[PDB]
């Protein structure tokens, strides 16, 4: 019944319920999510000394982000399985009040760790030319926080009030665009003065960044990307968490690995294998 300002996963769960496939996949993909993060934490810790001292902060901040991501995805995995429970007579999983409603907002507030750190860490690997370290940092952190907070507010209304949903997301999108702007600037300046091999890694980082970060606004909109459409369903629920997981792995783990490799490159006298 009355769900109020809740995520659409609950409305699907309280009305149609989820098939075995939809319920199991979502639980598996979230579990895959946190396993990758913990493993990633290990990777980043064990490779600290593969780069020169001054680049090591980047490994450290990658680890920091792994810790946050693992904790969150682990909790979000337990929340999924607590929120939906098998009805034997129907053969589907339905909303289970005593489990709490499912809410993606857990992710959002944790981005207050992830986003600032991911943006920050590249500043310990590349060299700026025109732009100033503290200034890029502050721009990254202000815009990151605003983006997140406004998106956080909006997602609570994804069902109860489409207008607020779309307005807060548009506002949040403005801050996102600024971030893309500043990061492209940072990538370019970071290319100045370094080896082709290093420039190549930076170019890959920019494509990865652009695509992986754009997946998140995609996950925000997922339920409506097909207009009472195909995605406003358990299919859209699965797709949302799939997109999140692909994005987390890409934006966090792969991103950090590439930065580490750029760092090996820029290090004397170390080279990639």
């Amino acid at each position: 019944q009355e769900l109020g300002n809740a995520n659409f996963e609950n409305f699907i769960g309280a009305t149609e319920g989820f098939s075995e496939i939809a319920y199991q996949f979502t639980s598996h993909i979230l579990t895959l999510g946190y396993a990758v993060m913990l493993a990633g934490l290990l990777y980043f810790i064990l490779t600290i000394k593969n780069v020169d001292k001054k680049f090591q902060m980047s490994n450290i901040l990658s680890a920091v982000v792994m810790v946050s991501a693992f904790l969150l995805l682990y909790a979000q995995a337990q929340n999924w399985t607590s929120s939906f429970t098998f009805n034997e007579e129907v053969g589907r999983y339905f909303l289970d009040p005593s489990g709490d409603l499912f809410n993606n907002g857990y992710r959002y507030l944790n981005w207050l760790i992830d986003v600032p750190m991911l943006l920050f860490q590249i500043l310990f690997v590349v060299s700026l030319t025109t732009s100033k370290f503290s200034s890029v940092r502050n721009q990254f952190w202000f815009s990151g926080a605003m983006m997140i907070i406004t998106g956080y507010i909006g997602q609570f209304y994804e069902v109860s009030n489409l207008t607020a949903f779309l307005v807060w997301g548009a506002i949040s999108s403005a801050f996102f665009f600024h971030i893309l702007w500043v990061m492209k600037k940072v990538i370019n300046e970071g290319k100045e003065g370094i080896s082709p091999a290093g420039q190549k890694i930076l170019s890959n980082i920019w494509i990865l960044f652009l695509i992986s970060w754009t997946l998140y606004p995609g996950a925000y909109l997922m339920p409506y990307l097909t207009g009472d459409g195909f995605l406003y369903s358990e299919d859209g629920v699965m797709a949302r968490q799939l997109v999140y997981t692909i994005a987390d792995v890409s934006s966090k783990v792969i991103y950090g690995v590439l930065l580490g490799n750029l760092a090996i490159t820029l290090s004397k006298n170390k080279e990639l294998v």
Copy 2:
């Protein structure tokens, strides 16, 4: 509903209940709280060797605080989610007896670890002049203990007895002012004998300490800061936990980072 000497979160949850936003936000913010601490733990451990040996005890102590803060904030997060349970009829979360009442007391007793350590660790980075190490340490430790223990007793009565609440709070404040007094002295003496860049960091630390520590009494009084005011509601519950989380992150993590940076400047190693 007989709740007795319980925090006001339980009275709101037992009467009005919590909206989806109030219950979820409070849970997210408590969850961000403990995630920050475990993340911070890693940071402080992995940066120990960025400062001269004589300063590394500050990093170690920052790490120790992170361990404690993670455990307690993790527990406090679980306390929140099991104390309130969704009612499908009206779509609000209400007090769930079988999960225990919710109490902010976990956090308070955490301070019994953290406060002594956070005040203690700056003494491993700065050098005192006219003050004696042991005498400062002792005043930090005693006044901190009394501040927290008196506040801890007091918060049990925030609803059941407003007079005891305020009187214990008032007493707690007196020890707080003493710690502020002692800390400013430590910071001033620490400025002596070090470079201006170091002095600049200590100034930032003092302002951070001042603002972040004052937030806690703010959180103490939160429900009544608007008088049956606007904050005597789920909004006040949200604001209280938000303020705690900001204060913990500031007084623990940012404080630790600034001390580490100070230790780097003082180290015969530079900043970026």
Copy 3:
């Protein structure tokens, strides 16, 4: 009896139930599973420096795989004990809806981490010759992904739609054969130049790889390997989890140890 697209473990659980020996053994073997992985993690971390710097990425990748494996086998172990509950009247464990249906899928998405990593780590130990580092990797990774993803879809139908089960299994099997193809090529190129002890180990790694990886298709089909036969029963359920656990220990822990030993010979003496 409305289970939908669910693993056969649930049908057995919901109809016959499991004997004490069947329920316990399956619980014990899953438990040994995740204990071995955590044990292995510690081993691989502590022996990183036993090889030359350039080989150490393989040790690291082994540790990384152990983390992922421990977490998933631990969860899978809990999935098991949560899904089936003792009935005191007949002395058997039956399906318990409130605990969620049991699904092996946790284990399949684990493979998305482990498979790409395992195939990858060998390239950090041996030298290629005619084919390039990036091309092998990319074929390993693409083929592994497709293998896992098609097998994953297939296992949901292992009872509800036998055809889908077999088709998806076959498609998956194609990418598997492709992987076996590239790998043997990798093993072969890797044998050139190195001492005799090293080629031997590699030959073992290849036998280990071929057997352990073939075990997974066996577990996939287990319940039907005797046709409603002997393995379409709790005995089939025990066998499947026993085979997964042997496979996983072989393909990740034993495989990793050998690669480590190879790296020591190419460095330091055993």
Copy 4:
């Protein structure tokens, strides 16, 4: 019908616990295990602050922390599962499904802590006329006997007062022997070291004497005021408060002081 159970369950089964009694007890158990895990990190991270020959003492502190953390963590959960809130009267009552609460968990775990704590001082100080192995054996035997006898006794703290007292008395005898040996060890360790080192060892002795004596205090607690004030939720709170003060003091502070002594004895200076 509770049987040979700790008095906590009798209070919990009849009068119940107030919000403050129940919350405090849970909080103090939680502080306890948090301190232990924090301490584990401290002792590991400071190993290299003393000469190699002293580092075993850090390692043994770490060992004790692992032990104390696990047990206090378990006991914290045991407390909250054993007593459940009753909404009609607003008190927490015994909840059998959670199991009866028992302090005996602590006792068996002292079979790790006690021997390791007594042992570790011998890797920091130097004996003079006494032998390392003899002091070790004395400590270890008396420690085991002290713990086992008390373990047995506490099961009868309500069901059989006489047994409770007799086993406690026997346990105390071994305790007194341990105090005797430790004092001899402290005195010997003072011979030939700097006054800074001697001062610490003196503090270690006072700390050791008070903190260890707190444990028999916790044992007797329900009866320390005779159906008195402490035979109630107040004595339940006090017993756990006392255990936690004792744990932090006997384990952490002790370990920190031994580490400081090791620094003074390292040829490394005390900040």
Copy 5:
């Protein structure tokens, strides 16, 4: 009522039930068990560098055994407390279906890690003379696995089929003697060419090994060691888990510590 092929713990628990002391003790001893192992894990990790590089694999293997033993003993502790639940009307803990039946087999399959590793590790400390590393290792691993698997099968029948219980146990014991035979040869060869101090430690390791490992077959038979006798009861239940815990600590931790000490004496380092 209908238990099938289940350990006798479940039969006692379902018929007479467990007293507070029997239930709490068994829980306490299991908790001390996993606590010792995790503490051991730290010790072995933290002492690796106290021996020459060639011997450090023995530490690593000791650590491997600790992780495995902690995990299993922790799981088994939780299974004890969820399999038996308090009945307030009677004052005893009875079988609780929904917690699953209790089974020691968890422990047995865990040995497939510990046994091969414990046997293997001594070969990174001692030097063989006439025997080959590989042959000994293979003999240890094959006989170990067969010992475990045959015993594991046997214990499922400890109540439901005395005949199979003893037959499978007898078979298991055959492989056990073989292991004893091989280990004795390994210890004799390891004594060759080393200082008497080292020889002495090896002699202790042998006695420790002989005794601690033999405790396991004792635990297997425990309920019948006194014939419907004394030990077929909650006392036998207590005794069994006590013996496992003593055995695990001795065979794992103390064994591991002596090997470390042996490694130190052989290291070109002193104890």
